[PDB]
Design an enzyme around this catalytic site. Structure first.
Site, PDB file in Angstrom:
ATOM      1  N   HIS A 274       0.805  -1.394   0.028  1.00  0.00           N
ATOM      2  CA  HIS A 274      -0.024   0.000   0.074  1.00  0.00           C
ATOM      3  C   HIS A 274       0.872   1.350  -0.035  1.00  0.00           C
ATOM      4  O   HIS A 274       1.919   1.185   0.065  1.00  0.00           O
ATOM      5  CB  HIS A 274      -0.904   0.022   1.288  1.00  0.00           C
TER       6      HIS A 274
ATOM      7  N   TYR B  97      -3.619   3.866   1.924  1.00  0.00           N
ATOM      8  CA  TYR B  97      -4.661   3.366   0.867  1.00  0.00           C
ATOM      9  C   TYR B  97      -3.989   2.529  -0.070  1.00  0.00           C
ATOM     10  O   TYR B  97      -2.744   2.395  -0.045  1.00  0.00           O
ATOM     11  CB  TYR B  97      -5.143   4.562   0.144  1.00  0.00           C
ATOM     12  N   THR B  98      -4.653   1.392  -0.506  1.00  0.00           N
ATOM     13  CA  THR B  98      -3.994   0.337  -1.254  1.00  0.00           C
ATOM     14  C   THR B  98      -4.502   0.348  -2.758  1.00  0.00           C
ATOM     15  O   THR B  98      -5.877   0.242  -3.177  1.00  0.00           O
ATOM     16  CB  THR B  98      -4.458  -0.920  -0.684  1.00  0.00           C
TER      17      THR B  98
HETATM   18  C1  LIG Z   1      -2.749  -0.970   5.722  1.00  0.00           C
HETATM   19  C2  LIG Z   1      -4.132  -0.309   5.320  1.00  0.00           C
HETATM   20  C3  LIG Z   1      -4.564   0.105   4.191  1.00  0.00           C
HETATM   21  C4  LIG Z   1      -5.932   0.532   3.880  1.00  0.00           C
HETATM   22  N1  LIG Z   1      -6.449   0.861   2.509  1.00  0.00           N
HETATM   23  C5  LIG Z   1      -7.572   1.240   2.225  1.00  0.00           C
HETATM   24  C6  LIG Z   1      -8.177   1.485   1.053  1.00  0.00           C
HETATM   25  O1  LIG Z   1      -7.474   1.203   0.029  1.00  0.00           O
HETATM   26  N2  LIG Z   1      -9.246   2.267   0.998  1.00  0.00           N
HETATM   27  C7  LIG Z   1     -10.080   2.478   1.965  1.00  0.00           C
HETATM   28  O2  LIG Z   1     -11.315   3.017   1.671  1.00  0.00           O
HETATM   29  N3  LIG Z   1      -9.433   2.575   3.192  1.00  0.00           N
HETATM   30  C8  LIG Z   1      -8.268   2.009   3.564  1.00  0.00           C
HETATM   31  N4  LIG Z   1      -7.742   1.777   4.784  1.00  0.00           N
HETATM   32  C9  LIG Z   1      -8.288   2.906   5.684  1.00  0.00           C
HETATM   33  C10 LIG Z   1      -7.774   4.238   5.679  1.00  0.00           C
HETATM   34  O3  LIG Z   1      -6.396   4.109   6.188  1.00  0.00           O
HETATM   35  C11 LIG Z   1      -8.576   5.066   6.619  1.00  0.00           C
HETATM   36  O4  LIG Z   1      -8.643   4.446   7.956  1.00  0.00           O
HETATM   37  C12 LIG Z   1      -9.894   5.610   6.240  1.00  0.00           C
HETATM   38  O5  LIG Z   1      -9.831   5.960   4.926  1.00  0.00           O
HETATM   39  C13 LIG Z   1     -10.542   6.489   7.179  1.00  0.00           C
HETATM   40  O6  LIG Z   1      -9.953   7.627   7.289  1.00  0.00           O
HETATM   41  P1  LIG Z   1     -10.562   8.831   7.983  1.00  0.00           P
HETATM   42  O7  LIG Z   1      -9.288   9.959   7.980  1.00  0.00           O
HETATM   43  O8  LIG Z   1     -11.194   9.358   6.509  1.00  0.00           O
HETATM   44  O9  LIG Z   1     -11.309   8.678   8.928  1.00  0.00           O
HETATM   45  P2  LIG Z   1     -10.839   9.058  10.639  1.00  0.00           P
HETATM   46  O10 LIG Z   1     -10.907  10.448  10.963  1.00  0.00           O
HETATM   47  O11 LIG Z   1      -9.430   8.434  11.100  1.00  0.00           O
HETATM   48  O12 LIG Z   1     -11.736   8.116  11.770  1.00  0.00           O
HETATM   49  C14 LIG Z   1     -13.036   7.827  11.662  1.00  0.00           C
HETATM   50  C15 LIG Z   1     -13.645   6.477  11.942  1.00  0.00           C
HETATM   51  O13 LIG Z   1     -14.687   6.691  12.425  1.00  0.00           O
HETATM   52  C16 LIG Z   1     -15.524   5.779  11.626  1.00  0.00           C
HETATM   53  N5  LIG Z   1     -16.512   6.606  10.903  1.00  0.00           N
HETATM   54  C17 LIG Z   1     -16.383   7.947  10.781  1.00  0.00           C
HETATM   55  N6  LIG Z   1     -17.378   8.297  10.039  1.00  0.00           N
HETATM   56  C18 LIG Z   1     -18.343   7.350   9.776  1.00  0.00           C
HETATM   57  C19 LIG Z   1     -19.273   7.081   9.057  1.00  0.00           C
HETATM   58  N7  LIG Z   1     -20.037   8.162   8.503  1.00  0.00           N
HETATM   59  N8  LIG Z   1     -19.995   5.809   8.785  1.00  0.00           N
HETATM   60  C20 LIG Z   1     -19.346   5.010   9.408  1.00  0.00           C
HETATM   61  N9  LIG Z   1     -18.274   4.942  10.152  1.00  0.00           N
HETATM   62  C21 LIG Z   1     -17.613   6.141  10.274  1.00  0.00           C
HETATM   63  C22 LIG Z   1     -14.866   5.189  10.701  1.00  0.00           C
HETATM   64  O14 LIG Z   1     -14.403   3.709  11.327  1.00  0.00           O
HETATM   65  C23 LIG Z   1     -13.743   5.738  10.484  1.00  0.00           C
HETATM   66  O15 LIG Z   1     -12.565   5.131  10.009  1.00  0.00           O
HETATM   67  C24 LIG Z   1      -6.529   1.107   4.847  1.00  0.00           C
HETATM   68  C25 LIG Z   1      -5.936   0.788   6.088  1.00  0.00           C
HETATM   69  C26 LIG Z   1      -4.938   0.339   6.447  1.00  0.00           C
HETATM   70  C27 LIG Z   1      -4.292   0.083   8.176  1.00  0.00           C
HETATM   71  N1  LIG Z   2      -5.101  -3.375   6.523  1.00  0.00           N
HETATM   72  C1  LIG Z   2      -5.203  -2.927   5.225  1.00  0.00           C
HETATM   73  O1  LIG Z   2      -4.549  -3.310   4.380  1.00  0.00           O
HETATM   74  C2  LIG Z   2      -6.406  -2.451   4.924  1.00  0.00           C
HETATM   75  C3  LIG Z   2      -6.950  -2.253   3.572  1.00  0.00           C
HETATM   76  C4  LIG Z   2      -8.205  -1.912   3.204  1.00  0.00           C
HETATM   77  C5  LIG Z   2      -9.308  -1.576   4.158  1.00  0.00           C
HETATM   78  N2  LIG Z   2      -8.945  -1.866   5.419  1.00  0.00           N
HETATM   79  C6  LIG Z   2      -9.841  -1.605   6.702  1.00  0.00           C
HETATM   80  O2  LIG Z   2     -11.126  -2.435   6.367  1.00  0.00           O
HETATM   81  C7  LIG Z   2     -12.177  -1.687   7.111  1.00  0.00           C
HETATM   82  C8  LIG Z   2     -13.285  -1.313   5.943  1.00  0.00           C
HETATM   83  O3  LIG Z   2     -14.235  -0.534   6.421  1.00  0.00           O
HETATM   84  P1  LIG Z   2     -15.625  -0.537   5.691  1.00  0.00           P
HETATM   85  O4  LIG Z   2     -16.141   0.826   6.320  1.00  0.00           O
HETATM   86  O5  LIG Z   2     -15.535  -0.637   4.433  1.00  0.00           O
HETATM   87  O6  LIG Z   2     -16.380  -1.768   6.479  1.00  0.00           O
HETATM   88  P2  LIG Z   2     -17.952  -1.826   6.816  1.00  0.00           P
HETATM   89  O7  LIG Z   2     -18.315  -1.006   8.126  1.00  0.00           O
HETATM   90  O8  LIG Z   2     -18.751  -1.478   5.809  1.00  0.00           O
HETATM   91  O9  LIG Z   2     -18.008  -3.588   7.070  1.00  0.00           O
HETATM   92  C9  LIG Z   2     -18.007  -4.287   6.245  1.00  0.00           C
HETATM   93  C10 LIG Z   2     -18.221  -5.748   6.646  1.00  0.00           C
HETATM   94  O10 LIG Z   2     -17.113  -5.772   7.804  1.00  0.00           O
HETATM   95  C11 LIG Z   2     -17.970  -6.980   8.734  1.00  0.00           C
HETATM   96  N3  LIG Z   2     -18.062  -6.297   9.849  1.00  0.00           N
HETATM   97  C12 LIG Z   2     -18.071  -5.066  10.099  1.00  0.00           C
HETATM   98  N4  LIG Z   2     -18.018  -4.912  11.584  1.00  0.00           N
HETATM   99  C13 LIG Z   2     -17.979  -6.167  12.165  1.00  0.00           C
HETATM  100  C14 LIG Z   2     -18.076  -6.769  13.387  1.00  0.00           C
HETATM  101  N5  LIG Z   2     -18.293  -5.774  14.574  1.00  0.00           N
HETATM  102  N6  LIG Z   2     -17.856  -8.128  13.447  1.00  0.00           N
HETATM  103  C15 LIG Z   2     -17.764  -8.886  12.574  1.00  0.00           C
HETATM  104  N7  LIG Z   2     -17.764  -8.357  11.382  1.00  0.00           N
HETATM  105  C16 LIG Z   2     -17.962  -7.100  11.017  1.00  0.00           C
HETATM  106  C17 LIG Z   2     -19.031  -7.080   8.009  1.00  0.00           C
HETATM  107  O11 LIG Z   2     -19.335  -8.454   7.203  1.00  0.00           O
HETATM  108  C18 LIG Z   2     -19.385  -6.188   7.236  1.00  0.00           C
HETATM  109  O12 LIG Z   2     -20.259  -6.285   6.182  1.00  0.00           O
HETATM  110  C19 LIG Z   2     -11.802  -0.590   7.643  1.00  0.00           C
HETATM  111  O13 LIG Z   2     -11.325  -1.022   9.014  1.00  0.00           O
HETATM  112  C20 LIG Z   2     -10.232  -0.421   7.013  1.00  0.00           C
HETATM  113  O14 LIG Z   2      -9.292   0.215   7.815  1.00  0.00           O
HETATM  114  C21 LIG Z   2      -7.488  -2.390   5.838  1.00  0.00           C
END
Ligand SMILES: Cc1cc2nc3c(=O)[nH]c(=O)nc-3n(C[C@H](O)[C@H](O)[C@H](O)COP(=O)(O)OP(=O)(O)OC[C@H]3O[C@@H](n4cnc5c(N)ncnc54)[C@H](O)[C@@H]3O)c2cc1C
Ligand SMILES: NC(=O)c1ccc[n+]([C@@H]2O[C@H](COP(=O)([O-])OP(=O)(O)OC[C@H]3O[C@@H](n4cnc5c(N)ncnc54)[C@H](O)[C@@H]3O)[C@@H](O)[C@H]2O)c1
Length: 271
Positions: A48, A64-65
């Site tokens: 990533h 982001y990946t």
């Molecule tokens: C190795 C790695 C790779 C990743 N690659 C990707 C990728 O390719 N694409 C991708 O989209 N993300 C990816 N993620 C997640 C990304 O890094 C961020 O964590 C994500 O974009 C959110 O950051 P933020 O600054 O916008 O939110 P933040 O301000 O840091 O935190 C807010 C958190 O509160 C929750 N939240 C806030 N608002 C809402 C809402 N309206 N509805 C539901 N939950 C909410 C969410 O959990 C959210 O993460 C990756 C994570 C890791 C560890």
């Molecule tokens: N480490 C990495 O390389 C990498 C890369 C991309 C995304 N991510 C992570 O993937 C997540 C994606 O978030 P999103 O908003 O798209 O997901 P989301 O909230 O829409 O949830 C998607 C699916 O995750 C599962 N899930 C959610 N909460 C759960 C729970 N409490 N118990 C069991 N299953 C659960 C469910 O099957 C759900 O449908 C973030 O945490 C993000 O950081 C990590």
């Protein structure tokens, strides 16, 4: 080779936003130009990048990946879920970086750095996986790979899937179980089903949704033991099992059920 963009993982490279496509109600594909049409990103498959910006007075760095690859000259594609403010009661402010990105105009820039990550797919079934950031990679070659993705966790999986399908001599079979909240939340569904239609022998595709629509032919609910048993290769075939999604998905839905089904910890990797 082509000129590489990411020459040192500690250096920041400002890249210009050149296109943005709606993936669904909250997710988008952001395309950024590389420094020239002939540059490649410099991205081992599975790794990533990090984006960084000063947002509302604070330093914000997020990984982001990319879903693109080093075959894609001149651009990089990210697929990013926007967490909007005033939507989820537990997170009224929304997400910092994702909303910042959503607010960017074509032509605006943001700094990239990388690549990073413990896994690299080297082709033809070969994975180089470091136990941690300070150890040498362990090289594991397999005939099949299980993939459990939740939401945007699809992004590293799609990198690996695309790398495999491009090589007609790569006989690795990918079994994807893709979990999302609802049917409309299934990211890049047309892309995934195109991959299934064209590479069915090397790509097995299954979905689960938290909330299922009327007529539904796949699974419903969080990832469970049944889904893992029926939609990932059996432990006897010694596949690698890759996981990526919300931390509780990994902790409570994947790990205990991989254990129940019989996949050893050594064969499992969480991005
Ligand atoms: C190795 C790695 C790779 C990743 N690659 C990707 C990728 O390719 N694409 C991708 O989209 N993300 C990816 N993620 C997640 C990304 O890094 C961020 O964590 C994500 O974009 C959110 O950051 P933020 O600054 O916008 O939110 P933040 O301000 O840091 O935190 C807010 C958190 O509160 C929750 N939240 C806030 N608002 C809402 C809402 N309206 N509805 C539901 N939950 C909410 C969410 O959990 C959210 O993460 C990756 C994570 C890791 C560890
Ligand atoms: N480490 C990495 O390389 C990498 C890369 C991309 C995304 N991510 C992570 O993937 C997540 C994606 O978030 P999103 O908003 O798209 O997901 P989301 O909230 O829409 O949830 C998607 C699916 O995750 C599962 N899930 C959610 N909460 C759960 C729970 N409490 N118990 C069991 N299953 C659960 C469910 O099957 C759900 O449908 C973030 O945490 C993000 O950081 C990590």
């Amino acid at each position: 080779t082509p000129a590489i963009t990411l020459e040192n993982p500690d250096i920041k490279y400002p890249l210009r936003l050149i296109d943005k496509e709606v993936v669904n109600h909250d997710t988008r594909r952001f395309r950024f130009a590389l420094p020239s049409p002939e540059h490649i990103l410099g991205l081992p498959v599975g790794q990533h990048i990090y984006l960084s910006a000063r947002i509302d007075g604070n330093l914000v760095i997020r990984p982001y990946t990319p879903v693109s690859s080093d075959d894609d000259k001149g651009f990089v594609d990210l697929v990013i879920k926007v967490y909007f403010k005033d939507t989820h009661p537990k997170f009224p402010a929304g997400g910092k970086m994702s909303q910042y990105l959503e607010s960017m105009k074509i032509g605006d820039t943001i700094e990239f750095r990388g690549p990073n990550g413990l896994l690299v797919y080297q082709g033809k079934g070969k994975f180089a996986i470091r136990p941690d950031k300070k150890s040498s990679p362990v090289i594991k070659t397999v005939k099949s790979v299980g993939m459990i993705a939740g939401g945007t966790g699809i992004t590293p999986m799609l990198q690996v899937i695309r790398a495999i399908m491009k090589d007609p001599d790569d006989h690795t079979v990918c079994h994807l179980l893709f979990a999302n909240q609802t049917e409309k939340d299934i990211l890049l569904r047309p892309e995934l089903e195109e991959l299934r239609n064209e590479h069915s022998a090397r790509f097995k595709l299954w979905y689960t949704v938290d909330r299922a629509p009327e007529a539904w032919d796949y699974s419903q609910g969080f990832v469970n033991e049944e889904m893992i048993r029926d939609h990932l290769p059996p432990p006897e075939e010694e596949p690698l099992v890759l996981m990526c999604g919300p931390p509780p998905m990994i902790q409570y839905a994947c790990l205990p059920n991989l254990e129940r089904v019989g996949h050893p910890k050594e064969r499992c990797f969480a991005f």
